[PDB]
């Protein structure tokens, strides 16, 4: 959602990796908040974070990095 395919392709191989490690971190922190029974959740995102990560990895493959 907040991150579309065009925008991912408009990134440089280095921006995808930077964007990748960024999403992974948001995710890890979402899971930490979740692990702590934290309610300030928004389920639609922890799910989107996974998909966003998949898209970036998909593109990195298509582009050759």
């Amino acid at each position: 959602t907040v991150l579309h395919v065009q925008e991912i392709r408009d990134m440089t191989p280095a921006e995808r990796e930077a964007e990748l490690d960024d999403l992974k971190t948001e995710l890890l922190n979402a899971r930490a908040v979740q692990a702590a029974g934290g309610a300030p959740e928004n389920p639609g995102r922890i799910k989107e974070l996974r998909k966003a990560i998949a898209r970036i990895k998909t593109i990195q493959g298509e582009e050759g990095d």
């Binding site: 992974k24 890890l28 922190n29 899971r31 930490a32 908040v33 979740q34 692990a35 702590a36 029974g37």
Partner: protein, 81 residues
């Protein structure tokens, strides 16, 4: 590719170790060695890992008790997540 750290293992006991022994507890991938746990943890929170104790849990996952150096403060590293 699998990641080393899965998420913070936050429970009463985990707190006592954090407040009283400067240790952080994590749920890690069971293919990960103490060494890999030590490194990963440092690179993710910018701290100095002094010791790591592991345990293969009856939940099917691995649990690591990571002790930080007197220079780092568990209570604080954990409070930002």
């Amino acid at each position: 590719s699998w990641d080393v750290i899965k998420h913070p293992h936050v429970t009463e006991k985990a707190m006592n170790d954090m407040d009283f022994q400067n240790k952080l507890q994590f749920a890690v991938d069971d293919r990960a060695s103490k060494g890999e746990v030590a490194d990963a943890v440092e690179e993710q929170y910018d701290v100095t890992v002094e010791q790591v104790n592991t345990q293969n849990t009856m939940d099917g996952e691995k649990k690591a008790v990571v002790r930080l150096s007197e220079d780092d403060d568990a209570q604080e590293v954990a409070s930002r997540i």
